[PDB]
Each structure stands twice: as structure tokens, then as C-alpha cells.
Write a protein that binds this ligand. Sequence first.
Ligand SMILES: N[C@@H](CCCC[NH3+])C(=O)O
Ligand code: NA
Length: 218
Amino acid sequence: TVRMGTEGAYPPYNFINDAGEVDGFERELGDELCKRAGLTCEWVKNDWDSIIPNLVSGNYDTIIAGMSITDERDEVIDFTQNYIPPTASSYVATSDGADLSGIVAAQTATIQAGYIAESGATLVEFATPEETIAAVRNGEADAVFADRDYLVPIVAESGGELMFVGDDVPLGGGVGMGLRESDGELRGKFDAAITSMKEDGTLNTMIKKWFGEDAAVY
Ligand SMILES: N[C@@H](CCCC[NH3+])C(=O)O
Ligand code: NA
């Protein structure tokens, strides 16, 4: 049994539905990958801040949680190939003239937080994605910098209270599954399953289903 670790707070990638079950793109993907690898799985929810150390300590066996493949994270864990192509990061604000060099909210331990910390903007970090949106809505922050695919439905749901500002920024290597560095054989099973979904078009279909007809595909 493979314990699949996810954040459960990052729609539409992953979330806990009203039944208390893991749901989202990654629920469907993860289940189909395990089916194709011949593995049975069990889903484990873990907060983003500790999702890497808790994989390393053996609380679960994979991270499938919208995590970009990066060299920095490759220092402690190993990634499969990407299962979504690299997509942009974007700024979101309550007005068009928001000061993007002011206070910018980003989720802790993300490439977006890293980009803002290196920038001239003042970074404020929040534990969860929803807290970054709340910080903008309530005026504690000038804007939020986050994954564009996370922000698109949020902007559409806002009834005009939230909007994209500035330009998109490409960050990170595409989303991939994380595993312990001593787990090469399991990682290889997942890699072989991902490749099979790329080859037969089922991954592209899953991506468009969850991210829209215009989503980047393979
Ligand atoms: N893909 C970005 C954002 C992840 C956001 C998780 N709620 C990263 O890996 O840092
Ligand atoms: Na590594």
C-alpha cells in the first residue's frame, strides 16, 4: 500500500471535499497512476509547511500536491517527471494600480515566496493558499503572487473584487511527484505510469477536464 501525501487545500489540484475525502485533479490522477502501476493507495493529508519533512520521516510515501520540480528541493527529495507542464505565476490584487513592489503575500515554502523574497517587494508568508487570498481581500497585503492556475478560478469567482495585475512570470519545472531519495524503485513505477498516460492521451484529457480547454498540455 502506497501512502499518497497531499495538502488538501489547493483547489483544483487537491482539496478535502464535503465528505472528508481527498478530491481534485491529483486525486483522480494519483488513483489512476496507482491503478496502472499495480499499487493500492491510501490518501494522507499533510500541511504544506511540513509536507517535505514528513515524507522524509516516513509518514507517507509520495507528495502529489502541486509541487514544482526544483533544484533546491532535489537537495532533499527526488521527483518523477512532470505531470503538468510548467505554468505561469501571476499577481492578483483588488485594483489595477496595486503596488507590486509593496507588501506581497505568498504561501510559505513555495517558488513564489522565493521569487518575492529575492525581489524588491516586501514578502509576507502564509501557511495556506486561502490565507494569501484573504490577506489581499482584507487589505493586509497589496497583492498575492501565486500559481496562475490556482488564481484563475479565484478571480472568476470574485465578482470583480479580485483581478490579475502585471505580467505572468514563468517559475519552476512543472509539477511532479516527490518521493524519498531511497525510493527509486517506487519512483520508477510512477514514472512508467505517467509516461503511459502521456503516450495514450489520458493525461491531456485529465488536464483539460480540471484546468480548462486552453490548459497547457503535452
Ligand atoms: N508550484 C509552486 C506552488 C505550490 C503551492 C501549494 N499550495 C511550488 O511548488 O512552490
Ligand atoms: Na534529490
